[PDB]
Design a protein around this ligand. Structure first.
Ligand SMILES: CCCCCCCCCCCCCCCCCCCC(=O)O[C@H](COC(=O)CCCCCCCCCCCCCC)COP(=O)(O)OCCN
Ligand SMILES: CCCCCCCCCCCCCCCCCCCC(=O)O[C@H](COC(=O)CCCCCCCCCCCCCC)COP(=O)(O)OCCN
Ligand SMILES: O=S(=O)(O)c1cc(N=C=S)ccc1/C=C/c1ccc(N=C=S)cc1S(=O)(=O)O
Ligand SMILES: CC(=O)N[C@@H]1[C@@H](O)[C@H](O)[C@@H](CO)O[C@H]1O
Ligand SMILES: CC(=O)N[C@@H]1[C@@H](O)[C@H](O)[C@@H](CO)O[C@H]1O
Lengths: 542, 539
């Protein structure tokens, strides 16, 4: 057993040894919750270390749950491929439809002309636009929307000679992305996650903990209206985004290190702006006027986004409330657009048969907006298992009883002083959300915090708001949040790079949430520090 | 001009014009039954005419049902990706694992070696091996695997001068021997597909529909019982098909047909040529531990399939009795084990017995994810799920009862003539379109009609479900036919003439073995069972 043996063969050692070492967890304790804990622990070690492919590791619960007796085999498979998963896959398909024509190149060339063709400036603009867009739309939709634009921008910069997308070349193993590509893709993913926290309709986590608070505490003086939540949350969101942008510049592009070879590259790229402006303008003119194919794709995309926005906005009715015979969710418009792409034609030259006294006749079947061959090749189909694993694991945790075990576990924190309690609550929320779905963590932690707040005589919002915002802060692993998985799949990003890079945003968001809550929340809700009367009534009743 | 536009642009006309033309059905009638019927009619016309891609057409229910009153968005999406579909996808992945590392080549060449080398014995060996392989793999995959071997043998035979691939002199016309070999391979693929549930998708479709419609039925189509029902008839008509082709092209029973002389030249000489080329082409190397491990995993998976719920003893799924397991943990277990296990075990030189060069990098596994992602057909998810979802919506909306009441008049006809008519109609419909589409269209209608009359549902569903897989006349009928017609430049007229034999043989064989052997496998097909009475009364 030389050291070289470990250097070469450590993945197999992990796969062989970890289950045997983790066996005592279930052997010592009787309940089924400990079986679920064992399975979760082994899956977590496989995710962090990446001994197996991620997609294969996500296939374990199908085998594991029926054997352990947690839940039946038919139910487990149905837990995959739920409504939200269909929405995600449809979004990826629509993005490929956009890429099939050259609309993404047109949009990229337009943006470069406005920005000024500087690598540092473009990155800032794309992050800000992504955050503003994600304030009103689901995060995965924004990430899928924005990925091809980033790809086109990187190709243009490479064409001008500024940078390289991939390192110069186990022939199967895909190319390793460069520092700048990592910076851009991680930037758009993090920007989606950070900008989501802005408004009440930005993401489902906000709606979840809002609903829990409203249900548990009616007759509450303080209220989470649409304007008030935004007024509370926006400044912190701005500070997150700017500080995260600065950190990303420092980590990957050598912002404050002039000697570093990273900075010299950006300096040489910026040196050539004057001629690059004419080059970009000429290359844009080289593209012809927008064809009908592009216009049709663009109209379909705008229609999809508008239908996304107007469903139960909360400030007016929307189309969901008109149709109340059955529940309708966001999967409907997406698949509608996917089908409509296959129905419509790319050209209308066949109309020359009946009009314009004839003309050049196609002499062939007319292509549609997209082809199935392009979809079957480009879509990453492993994401089905990776995303469905989260739903399956969450439902298994709920069925087994491990969630109640965790909720009982948090109760012991009552002894701590107030500020230390707030900090520990934020840390616990971040750690738990690292490995699981955001909504599940909110569901398990929030009611405990409400009850514990009533017990110890402090205002419930004081703990509820920071934790609810904290559940969204997931940056380390691809399995933490759908944007991470999407960007990892689109451009092959190894887990180690993401885990190392994610350190900055975590510290930044924790510190800034702590400070702005403790100070600015007092301004927005003046009675936060003190204990109100209606809280006393509920405490006495309970 | 006028005809040419229709010739080029008929698919767009269908797609545009069918929904508007079928709209009055929904407009004039008030019930939800008619909305479901309108959706069914449009989807059926799209599947038959191929106006829109099959996988894309299958996605319509997700949009259509929630907008109407049928079902919610969550429920419709759950209808996709059931247990059986996961079993089928895992089986495809395991078959890919077998294809990787070239085990099928070993089995095929070894069996051909064991059987004779003369042209007739070579034909017999090719047909039998193709049938056996197609029992567990997709049909087109088996055809693609098997064609190169006969191509090489034919090339060498032509080079020697013992036989000619083509007529002497707009592609060249293949001769009778080439037609015999290639058509035999395609037909063998199609016939052997029917033997097993995982052999072809149509089996999964009709089994899943039957299980969904009648959850209380006491007769079950589990993996072993289906095999018991299907295998003997498969062997009988495979043998009869082989005998038919030999008479049609090689003059088997005609002593001097001017076709037996070619075979006599083949048996006199070039037997050694074929033997040498096949023996040399079997130079894969010694059997390796990688292949052995894959083989053991496959055998273990099948053994787990048989011992789920046997009548003789308990077995698993009874020792683990808290929840249902249902033939889905073995398949995914094998798939994961393929990624866990190494392929060399040469790294054990490090510990002791250092007899050779040690590895300098990570050791590969039995398979890679890149191979899986590029080879698996992922549209089957949408196609199969769409079939299941349409069936379930038909059940819930209430349109199923309306169709059954309409077909009550067929009660006067005797049971045997009804079975024959069902088989004939299934074959005729299959002639022009996809097998899975036809199964989706016709199986639920048969189930409801069976409830209306006093007939056991299996009695009609099994023969029709198997008949949906019998397609030989045209390239459009099934992908193996198209692949074979592409390889050897087969004109349509010859294929249509040659396919007459298998049609009659399979029809007669199904007609006889159903009525006789099914009663041995299912003793209660002649009677009307109690649970059927309960279902009919409730409906
Ligand atoms: C009530 C119902 C209960 C049901 C229970 C079901 C349990 C199922 C789950 C089982 C979990 C464990 C599975 C382990 C599989 C074998 C893993 C072997 C890994 C291996 O050999 O790695 C090498 C080093 O091994 C070493 O150094 C390890 C020592 C040698 C191990 C030899 C293993 C093979 C021989 C035995 C096979 C059977 C094992 C038991 C099933 C280096 O490999 P690498 O990293 O270079 O390349 C890896 C390419 N993937
Ligand atoms: C309670 C009420 C419920 C109502 C329910 C209604 C349900 C409606 C369902 C959808 C119906 C509309 C379908 C829209 C797409 C039509 C696609 C036509 C394709 C086309 O032009 O085909 C060409 C010939 O067209 C022709 O010769 C025909 C004329 C084509 C005109 C094109 C018009 C485009 C805009 C249509 C808007 C429709 C809005 C909805 C009415 C030849 O094509 P090919 O074979 O060469 O290529 C094939 C690949 N494409
Ligand atoms: O988590 S739960 O399975 O309990 C769940 C129940 C619901 N009940 C109802 S209606 C609705 C949603 C829901 C889970 C949603 C997600 C679960 C995991 C995600 N990412 C990962 S990994 C993202 C979402 S998201 O769609 O909310 O963004
Ligand atoms: C119990 C109820 O419905 N409403 C009470 C209200 O009567 C009381 O004056 C107030 C004190 O802040 O707390 C709340
Ligand atoms: C709940 C239910 O469907 N029960 C029926 C039962 O009434 C019937 O006697 C039996 C036939 O063997 O099939 C089952």
């Amino acid at each position: 057993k030389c050291s070289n043996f470990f250097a070469n063969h450590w993945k197999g050692l992990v796969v062989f040894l970890v289950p045997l070492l983790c066996l005592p967890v279930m052997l010592l304790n009787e309940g089924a919750e400990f079986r679920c804990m064992y399975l979760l622990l082994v899956m977590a070690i496989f995710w962090v270390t990446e001994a197996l492919p991620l997609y294969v590791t996500s296939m374990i619960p199908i085998v594991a749950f029926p054997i352990m007796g947690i839940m039946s085999s038919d139910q487990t498979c149905r837990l995959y491929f739920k409504d939200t998963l269909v929405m995600f896959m449809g979004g990826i398909m629509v993005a490929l439809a956009v890429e099939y024509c050259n609309l993404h190149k047109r949009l990229a060339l337009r943006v470069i002309q406005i920005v000024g063709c500087s690598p540092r400036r473009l990155h800032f603009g794309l992050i800000m636009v992504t955050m503003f867009l994600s304030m009103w739309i689901s995060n995965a939709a924004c990430t899928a929307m924005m990925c091809p634009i980033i790809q086109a921008v990187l190709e243009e910069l490479q064409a001008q000679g500024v940078c390289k997308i991939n390192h110069e070349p186990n022939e199967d193993e895909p190319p390793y992305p460069t520092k700048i590509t990592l910076c851009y893709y991680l930037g758009i993913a993090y920007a989606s996650s950070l900008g989501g926290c802005g408004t009440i309709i930005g993401t489902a986590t906000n709606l979840t903990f809002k609903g829990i608070y409203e249900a548990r505490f009616k007759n509450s003086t303080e209220q989470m209206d649409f304007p008030t939540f935004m007024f509370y949350s926006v400044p912190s969101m701005l500070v997150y985004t700017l500080l995260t942008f600065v950190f990303l510049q420092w980590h990957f592009m050598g912002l404050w290190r002039p000697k570093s070879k990273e900075a010299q590259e950006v300096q040489r790229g910026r040196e050539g702006a004057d001629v690059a402006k004419k080059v970009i303008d000429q290359r844009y003119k080289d593209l012809g006027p927008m064809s009908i194919h592009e216009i049709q794709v663009m109209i379909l995309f705008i229609f999809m986004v508008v239908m996304y926005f107007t469903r139960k906005p909360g400030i007016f009715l929307g189309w969901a409330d008109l149709l109340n015979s059955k529940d309708i969710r966001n999967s409907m418009p997406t698949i509608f657009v996917v089908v409509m792409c296959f129905m419509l034609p790319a050209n209308y030259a066949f109309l020359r048969y009946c009009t314009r006294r004839g003309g050049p006749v196609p002499t062939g079947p007319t292509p549609s907006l997209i082809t199935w061959k392009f979809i079957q090749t480009k879509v990453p189909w492993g994401l089905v298992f990776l995303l469905g694993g989260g739903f399956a694991l969450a439902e298994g945790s709920k069925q087994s009883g491990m969630a109640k075990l965790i909720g009982n576990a948090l109760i012991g924190l009552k002894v701590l002083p107030n500020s230390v309690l707030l900090l520990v609550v934020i840390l616990v929320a971040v750690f738990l959300t690292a490995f699981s779905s955001n909504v599940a963590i909110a569901n398990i932690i929030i009611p405990v915090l409400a009850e514990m707040s009533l017990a110890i005589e402090i205002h419930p919002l004081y703990l509820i708001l920071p934790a609810g915002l904290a559940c969204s802060m997931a940056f380390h692993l691809p399995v933490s949040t759908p944007p991470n998985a999407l960007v990892a799949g689109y451009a092959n990003i190894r887990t180690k790079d993401m885990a190392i890079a994610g350190i900055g945003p975590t510290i930044i968001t924790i510190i800034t949430l702590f400070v702005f809550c403790q100070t600015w929340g007092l301004v927005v809700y003046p009675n936060l520090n003190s204990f109100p009367e209606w809280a006393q009534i509920y405490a006495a009743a309970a």
